[PDB]
């Protein structure tokens, strides 16, 4: 059981050591499309690339590339798209991807500015009466409503395909309180946020995969998917304690590199799953 594994690693202070064994066992697949010179300005970080085998392709004939991966968790029956925070020049590609994949929810785990630098373009409208038009991808985005809470904001958005005049409702879940440095002290508000996303229907198989991002789409984004998948597997299995976080994380690392960026994020992920299991058992 992971609670006792947690005390062992914590009492022995072995988090950096566990973390390094995960780094050393992690998959390495080619990322040739990401490294093409025509794609250099579609990547926020030169060391964070989608693998070719799992990358999302845009349906535009010119250049199909976006920095985004499909993470398919076969046993849990959950998919996720993990992507970077959009750049000024990729906001239109981001919303094209949401449209094409039939996503219902976007999960944002960063602020637009952190540590005095921009982590993400402002890719949604701030006021009802000032909609955004993405001329490169022929989409319109309107803010319908905004519900601001202590730890997160939920926004209803309308996305309109200007080519076909179809509209969809998109839910934006914005976790606003992750600290600039380190991880939250308690996983309580993070779990509350994860249960709100679940309650919306955004993670359900009647929609396309949820889009999840932070700045790079690997660190905080990784913690979100890992916690969700581990708690779902504990509901599904005859023996909930057969669930090994380390194995789930390595299975997820087959689809996108670098998920869980620090030993502190690994410790936080254990704490989130351990605490979430109390609300589920």
UniProtKB/Swiss-Prot annotation:
Query: Which residues, renumbered to this chain, carry the PTM Phosphoserine?
Result: 49, 241-242
Report which reactions are catalysed by this protein: O-phospho-L-tyrosyl-[protein] + H2O = L-tyrosyl-[protein] + phosphate
GO MF annotations in UniProt: cadherin binding; enzyme binding; ephrin receptor binding; insulin receptor binding; non-membrane spanning protein tyrosine phosphatase activity; protein kinase binding; protein phosphatase 2A binding; protein tyrosine phosphatase activity
Question: Where S-nitrosocysteine occurs, residue numbers?
Answer: 214
For the modification Cysteine sulfenic acid (-SOH), the affected residues are: 214
Give every Tyrosine-protein phosphatase domain span: 2-276
Which residues get modified to Cysteine persulfide? 214
- EC number(s) per UniProt? 3.1.3.48
Q: What class of enzyme is it?
A: hydrolase
Q: Provide the disulphide bond pattern.
A: none
Tell me which Gene Ontology terms the entry assigns under biological process.
actin cytoskeleton organization; cellular response to angiotensin; cellular response to fibroblast growth factor stimulus; cellular response to hypoxia; cellular response to nerve growth factor stimulus; cellular response to nitric oxide; cellular response to platelet-derived growth factor stimulus; cellular response to unfolded protein
Which residues are catalytic?
Answer: 214
Q: What main location does UniProt list?
A: endoplasmic reticulum
Residues with the modification Phosphotyrosine, per the entry, are 19, 65
Q: Where does the entry say this protein is expressed, by tissue? A: Expressed in keratinocytes (at protein level).
Q: Where's the N,N-(cysteine-1,S-diyl)serine (Cys-Ser) crosslink?
A: 214-215
Q: What is the effect of changing residue 49 to A/D?
A: No phosphorylation
Would you tell me the Gene Ontology cellular component terms? cytoplasm; cytoplasmic side of endoplasmic reticulum membrane; cytosol; early endosome; endoplasmic reticulum; endosome lumen; glutamatergic synapse; mitochondrial crista
Q: Which domain of life is it from?
A: Eukaryota
Subunit-structure text: Interacts with EPHA3 (phosphorylated); dephosphorylates EPHA3 and may regulate its trafficking and function. Interacts with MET. Interacts with NCK1.
Q: Which family does it belong to?
A: Belongs to the protein-tyrosine phosphatase family. Non-receptor class 1 subfamily.
Name of the protein in question: Tyrosine-protein phosphatase non-receptor type 1
From what organism does this protein derive?
Homo sapiens (Human)
Shown portion of the whole protein?
A: 2 to 282 of 435
